[PDB]
Amino acid sequence: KPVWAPHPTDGFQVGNIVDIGPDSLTIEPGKTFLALINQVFPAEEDSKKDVEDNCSLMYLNEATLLHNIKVRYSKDRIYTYVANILIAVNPYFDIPKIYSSETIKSYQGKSLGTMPPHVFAIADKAFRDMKVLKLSQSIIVSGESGAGKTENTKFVLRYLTESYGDRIVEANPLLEAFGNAKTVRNNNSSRFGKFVEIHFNEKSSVVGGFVSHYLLEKSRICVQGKEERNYHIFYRLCAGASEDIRERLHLSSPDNFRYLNRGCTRYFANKETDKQILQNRKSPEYLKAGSLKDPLLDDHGDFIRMCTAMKKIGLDDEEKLDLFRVVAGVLHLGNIDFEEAGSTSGGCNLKNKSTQALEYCAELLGLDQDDLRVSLTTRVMIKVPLKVEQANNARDALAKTVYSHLFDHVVNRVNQCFPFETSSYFIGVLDIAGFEYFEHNSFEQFCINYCNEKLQQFFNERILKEEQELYQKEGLGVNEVHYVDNQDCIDLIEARLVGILDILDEENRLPQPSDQHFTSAVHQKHKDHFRLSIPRKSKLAIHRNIRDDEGFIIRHFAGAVCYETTQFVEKNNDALHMSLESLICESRDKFIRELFLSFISVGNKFKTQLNLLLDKLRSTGASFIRCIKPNLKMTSHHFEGAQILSQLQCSGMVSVLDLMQGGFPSRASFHELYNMYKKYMPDKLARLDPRLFCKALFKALGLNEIDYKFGLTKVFFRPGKFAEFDQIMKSDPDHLAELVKRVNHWL
Ligand SMILES: Nc1ncnc2c1ncn2[C@@H]1O[C@H](COP(=O)(O)OP(=O)(O)O)[C@@H](O)[C@H]1O
Numbered sequence: 001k002p003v004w005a006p007h008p009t010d011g012f013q014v015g016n017i018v019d020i021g022p023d024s025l026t027i028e029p030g031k032t033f034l035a036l037i038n039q040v041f042p043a044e045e046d047s048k049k050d051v052e053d054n055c056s057l058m059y060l061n062e063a064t065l066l067h068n069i070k071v072r073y074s075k076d077r078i079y080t081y082v083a084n085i086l087i088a089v090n091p092y093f094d095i096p097k098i099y100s101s102e103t104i105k106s107y108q109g110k111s112l113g114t115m116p117p118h119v120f121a122i123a124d125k126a127f128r129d130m131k132v133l134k135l136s137q138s139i140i141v142s143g144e145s146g147a148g149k150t151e152n153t154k155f156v157l158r159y160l161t162e163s164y165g166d167r168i169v170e171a172n173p174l175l176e177a178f179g180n181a182k183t184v185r186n187n188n189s190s191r192f193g194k195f196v197e198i199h200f201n202e203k204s205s206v207v208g209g210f211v212s213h214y215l216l217e218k219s220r221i222c223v224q225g226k227e228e229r230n231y232h233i234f235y236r237l238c239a240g241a242s243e244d245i246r247e248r249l250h251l252s253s254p255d256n257f258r259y260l261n262r263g264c265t266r267y268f269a270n271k272e273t274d275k276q277i278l279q280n281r282k283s284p285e286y287l288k289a290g291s292l293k294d295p296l297l298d299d300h301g302d303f304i305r306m307c308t309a310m311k312k313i314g315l316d317d318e319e320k321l322d323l324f325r326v327v328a329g330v331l332h333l334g335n336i337d338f339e340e341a342g343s344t345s346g347g348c349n350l351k352n353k354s355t356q357a358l359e360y361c362a363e364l365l366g367l368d369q370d371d372l373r374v375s376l377t378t379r380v381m382i383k384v385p386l387k388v389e390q391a392n393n394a395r396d397a398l399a400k401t402v403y404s405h406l407f408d409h410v411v412n413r414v415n416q417c418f419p420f421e422t423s424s425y426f427i428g429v430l431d432i433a434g435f436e437y438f439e440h441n442s443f444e445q446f447c448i449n450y451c452n453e454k455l456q457q458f459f460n461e462r463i464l465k466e467e468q469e470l471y472q473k474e475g476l477g478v479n480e481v482h483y484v485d486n487q488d489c490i491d492l493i494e495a496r497l498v499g500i501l502d503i504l505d506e507e508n509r510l511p512q513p514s515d516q517h518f519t520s521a522v523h524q525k526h527k528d529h530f531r532l533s534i535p536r537k538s539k540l541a542i543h544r545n546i547r548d549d550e551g552f553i554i555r556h557f558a559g560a561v562c563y564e565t566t567q568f569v570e571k572n573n574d575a576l577h578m579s580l581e582s583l584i585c586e587s588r589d590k591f592i593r594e595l596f597l598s599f600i601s602v603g604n605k606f607k608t609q610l611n612l613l614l615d616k617l618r619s620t621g622a623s624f625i626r627c628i629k630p631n632l633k634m635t636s637h638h639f640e641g642a643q644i645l646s647q648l649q650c651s652g653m654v655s656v657l658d659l660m661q662g663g664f665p666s667r668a669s670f671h672e673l674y675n676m677y678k679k680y681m682p683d684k685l686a687r688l689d690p691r692l693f694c695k696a697l698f699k700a701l702g703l704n705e706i707d708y709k710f711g712l713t714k715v716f717f718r719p720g721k722f723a724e725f726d727q728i729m730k731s732d733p734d735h736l737a738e739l740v741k742r743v744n745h746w747l
């Protein structure tokens, strides 16, 4: 029989065992290679078939899991179950029909396994659980950058509002314009986290929604790498705005703006949409290299779609122009340059070249030109002149705070489109920025990856720990599955006083803060810690010349990442000098007013916000969608086996599949079940042990003895029995009577 043995790029390959040695099996893919006995797995007999639930495989192991997902992917089936957990592999193209209104209708009220695997089925299951258990629900959509979390979040939201309700759906282009950006991992990367709650009444009908937003990436506002961009809105506005709007806002091609021109200044466009962009909007880079290519994104088309979206959800033209005005104001702010004053003030002056930028910025932000000049080049502390570098920092700090408060306003404005006075329960969907790394990793990556650690820990806690504790408490005798927990990595980062975030905070507060001093402290205070290393020990050449006090490696659950620690101290400080806060809070423009040691910890904001979020998640029933990124090239039909296997492993899916060999995803109190059916029962079953009625019910419903197991207080059901479980659980008088009548006929 063919078996699975290791392959360095496919993860596993098919072969036959031709020989055996002390520590090896000899695998024929006349040619042979050696494999460890424990690295060789049985294969499914039919290599061309697939199963919708990996629990249905004859052999449950990482190799058969990988292959099943692969076969499905090759047939454009991106969704596959492991019991009630969904695996979604990014197709990197639009699969026809699978998100249609017809498809949506077909999933309504269907138990898991009665329809093909789909995000819609996870959404419907959350809805069903909310109704049956009278408990708010969370759907956690996890995965690395570019895996498909945001797309799947949108599908869930569309499903729920279309089935059980639209403005929640329609508002999305607005959030993405202000909070998403091109990174090298994802053309449409989310640079903020969100928890979107759909709220329901007692009849389980949608009454409104609420979007909680988290931790916008502020550094991106001012600078980007050459392959990356600022937030979409800048490019959508420059590409799509009318000439009247362009003139009023003094806009031009992106290369004319410091806050855009260190990044990629090319638009997403195709042959057709390029013709719709006016010549005066195109940068030299765009004219030379042409447009950026994407199946989803198009700067001109997205500007139009965004404006349509704004109108549909109730934003008036004044509101729209206000938003654009602040965006342009931030752009002109960035164009203000400073120079050495010399012995006059000892500080700096605005460059003569920056006169227009000062004028435009002041006009758009409702500020007096001189007030802005003074606030950027001096500070009362005595009114002292600032040095050029401090002026640069003042400018950028103001820009970041203005844009960030604008984003806050956008999210608030969105919430105002679907408000509700009261609700019974909610279904919330969590979409965070996912695990990411690059040639050069900084504090932004450190914070993003920390959040991903925390979320993986929640999965481990809910699915691998608590599940097994339940089986144990109920006396089920399910074989224990051991796994590598990541709490130690979390503690390295967030522990009081000694954790990296607190050591960083300590540095910000020292007389002479230093990235090197901070980095040395991290290594010194964490001698021998398993989750920390020095850059010279990196697996990658690019990191080998970083000094011990210039970086560190964190052994994340998803892989080791080497961080350069330059700018960690400055990036940890969210504070805005009162001079700048006062300037903007006293703007002559109402809209801008309504948006609104010197040290505020960014790291402590990551920790505090995540812990609040985790509190909310812990109070809800949780469902999980594990998004998988198939390759690093954003291409369709390119399944990178080893890459995908790595994700299945670190996400915990291999551990979960192991547990499911003998686990039970569905359960209820058998006393409560008996109590529910009691009023309809004939004396002959009413008199017997409550487990006996249950057994009679199960058998009448066609369940076999192996499908269920009675614990101490709860009855448990195996994977693939969700349909029968859902039938048993219905509390409707008609349905209870129906099933008892079936039992009566069975007897
Ligand atoms: N189900 C899908 N169908 C079509 N394209 C998809 C799907 N999921 C992801 N994509 C593509 O992959 C890109 C990245 O997906 P996204 O959800 O933004 O990733 P992230 O996990 O970072 O939120 C999308 O912009 C889109 O091009």
Ligand code: VO4
Pocket (backbone or CB within 6 Å): 143, 144, 145, 146, 147, 149, 150, 185, 186, 188, 189, 190, 191, 432, 433, 434, 435
């Ligand atoms: O590329 V993502 O939306 O996980 O940040």
Ligand SMILES: [Mg+2]
Pocket (backbone or CB within 6 Å): 149, 150, 151, 188, 189, 190, 432, 433
């Ligand atoms: Mg995203």
